[PDB]
């Protein structure tokens, strides 16, 4: 009977709440009250990469910190050289509706996907010299939202049927499926040691997954609406999320609870992208009022504003060396800040 | 060796830019329409389906969305730069659901500059349903509604000419309130036997572009 199972679920939730409250001895603000402020930081535009035809939905850097890939609903991907503002490749696509793009750590492959429910892998360092489709990965039901490369042979993808998958590119099959979510999964971030990854979905919840075992270990709750952006702390023991209630929160993995919240009275728009810096002191968030804001991760006070985009800001990324920040928006421009 | 690499990069950039201009010339001359709702009929006239047809030497492109869940609050934001959105309504409680979907589409933040064409199919079903022995139950305003003086009846009952303009006015009440001059609505009465739907779409797109140009010049 459903009644006893519901009662047992409520009892377990109450036990979890008591266990969590038994460990909240102090807050982060009280601990960091004596730390000096970071101070005002002003950073200016350095490059403007023009050449796209329609809105830009995703972009990704490379491990070499010089090349990046951009995808637009025009139906093309372009690989740029930031140092000399010269393009290196331009790959035509079959379907013109794209939502994500990825760059392999080695630098040999790129991936794309969207409303066609197919992830396509492209080979760059080819003997003939022309980019071609290497494989098409099929099996999902809804649209693809994000994709990341574990290595040259594994890839993890998140889709709109409330599922995530791990593929083997060579064979073209699924190794493990991840289930548990109720709404569409929007973003995912890999751990620096590629052993774990987090996923954010449209149910105000985020979960920690184990790649080898394929089971969910922790579930985090405390938001108010759908979450769109997720990022990992460089340490590997924290992560930050952005949602549609105009709020960013910081969670921790060893205490299983929210640590801090970032909000302001004048901000009433949503959050699209969230990223950190190298040291972890700075948090960059891109909003829907055509602005990008820089926060202090241990003090919850604003430190600056990035302006210059005439439409909504969709993608955000920080170079591995931490020397640049790249933002792309819906007006078909990329700008590199420093 | 650096100079040689720079020269190679410059040559590659020039070639890519030439190809990009060639692709621009073709992309910027095709009109994109999204169809959501009897749809298949109007179409014979995977994640997504595409069809291409040309009328009067103008290229058009239609998209039908399938194999997706009913939760469509996240992927509807892709279709903001399309020329028009085609809405198909059975028009024969499903009408209330259609009205709520139209209301949600109309007032969305990211679709404030996009216009809607609206097709009301199955009028033949309406004719017999009316003159076969009742819409005062799901709509109690029907008892105080009169056929407008600016109507346009077709030859062949004065109780079928009613309730068509009733559904039309229910759909137009949303359109004419809480909407600026950025987008409009174009309602048409079609059946499965109609063959002139392409011409209606052509004329409506022409009107959309002309009205946008007039708004730009602050002449309207």
């Amino acid at each position, epitope marked *: 009977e459903l009644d006893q199972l519901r009662q047992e679920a409520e009892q377990l939730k109450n036990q979890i709440r008591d266990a969590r409250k038994a460990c909240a001895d102090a807050t982060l603000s009280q601990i960091t009250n004596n730390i000096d402020p970071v101070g005002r930081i002003q950073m200016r535009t350095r490059r403007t990469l023009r050449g796209h035809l329609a809105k830009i939905y995703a972009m990704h850097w490379g491990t070499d910190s010089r090349l990046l890939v951009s995808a637009s609903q025009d139906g093309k991907l372009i690989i740029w050289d930031s140092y000399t503002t010269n393009k290196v490749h331009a790959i035509p696509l079959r379907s013109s509706w794209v939502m994500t793009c990825a760059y392999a750590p080695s630098g040999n492959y790129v991936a794309c996907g969207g409303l066609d429910n197919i992830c396509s892998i492209y080979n760059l360092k080819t003997r003939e010299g022309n980019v071609r489709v290497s494989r098409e990965l099929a099996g999902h039901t809804g649209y693809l939202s994000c994709c990341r490369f574990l290595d040259d042979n594994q890839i993890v993808t998140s889709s709109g049927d409330t599922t995530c998958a791990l593929w083997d590119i060579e064979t073209g099959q699924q190794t493990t499926t991840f289930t548990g979510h109720t709404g569409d999964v929007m973003s995912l971030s890999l751990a620096p040691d590629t052993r774990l990854f987090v996923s954010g979905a*449209c149910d105000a919840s985020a979960k920690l997954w184990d790649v080898r075992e394929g089971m969910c270990r922790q579930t985090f709750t405390g938001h*108010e*609406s759908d979450i769109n952006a997720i990022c990992f702390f460089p340490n590997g023991n924290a992560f930050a999320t952005g949602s549609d209630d105009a709020t960013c929160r910081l969670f921790d993995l060893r205490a299983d609870q929210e640590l801090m919240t970032y909000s302001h009275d004048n901000i009433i728009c949503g959050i699209t992208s969230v990223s950190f810096s190298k040291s972890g002191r700075l948090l960059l968030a891109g909003y829907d009022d055509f602005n990008c804001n820089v926060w202090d991760a241990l003090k919850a006070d604003r430190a600056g504003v990035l302006a210059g985009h005439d439409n909504r800001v969709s993608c955000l990324g920080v170079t591995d060396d931490g020397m640049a920040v790249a933002t792309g928006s819906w007006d078909s421009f990329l700008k590199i800040w420093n | 060796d650096q100079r040689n690499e720079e020269k190679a990069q410059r040559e590659a950039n020039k070639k890519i830019e030439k190809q990009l201009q060639k692709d621009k010339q073709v992309y910027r001359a095709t009109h994109r329409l999204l169809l959501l709702g009897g749809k298949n009929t109007i179409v014979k006239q995977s994640g997504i389906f595409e069809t291409k047809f040309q009328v009067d030497k103008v290229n058009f492109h239609m998209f039908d969305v399938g194999a997706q869940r*009913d*939760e469509r609050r996240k992927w509807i934001q892709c279709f903001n730069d399309v020329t028009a959105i085609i809405f198909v309504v059975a028009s024969s409680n499903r009408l209330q659901a259609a009205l709520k979907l139209f209301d949600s589409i109309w007032n969305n933040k990211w679709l404030r500059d996009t216009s809607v064409i609206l097709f009301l199919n199955k009028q033949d079903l309406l004719a017999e349903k009316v003159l076969a022995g009742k819409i005062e139950d799901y709509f109690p305003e029907f008892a105080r509604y009169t056929t407008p003086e600016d109507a346009t009846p077709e030859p062949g009952d004065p109780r079928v000419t009613r309730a068509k303009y009733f559904i039309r006015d229910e759909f137009l009440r949303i359109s004419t309130a809480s909407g600026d001059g950025r987008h409009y609505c174009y309602p048409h009465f079609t059946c499965a036997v109609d063959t002139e739907n392409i011409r209606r779409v052509f004329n409506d797109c022409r009107d959309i572009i002309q009205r946008m140009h007039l708004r730009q010049y602050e002449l309207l």
Partner: nanobody
Amino acid sequence: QVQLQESGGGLVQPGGSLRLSCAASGFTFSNYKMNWVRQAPGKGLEWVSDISQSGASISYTGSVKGRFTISRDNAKNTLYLQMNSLKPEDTAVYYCARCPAPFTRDCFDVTSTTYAYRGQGTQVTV
């Protein structure tokens, strides 16, 4: 966490009266638009009423006008829905749904199945 508990259902004779309530915890009640949906036996979800963040705008479906009245108490975080002049065709489970995003006029994906922000529901039988 977000949670919506509703109560007040039961069995009433034709021409009766009932008052259903919903208690909301986990979000700012004054920033959202609230709804009432119902599911008849062997049918899909159907929209009944709506309410704005201040109570100015109220809309009802065609078959319930005059019979049903809606209310909103922001101080106590409660949503009511007064029912009178009941008819046998009103036997269903009644849910309480909330708009996905705050400070928004549109309301997407409320009458859909597998919707996150919705309660368990109270059974009403006539």
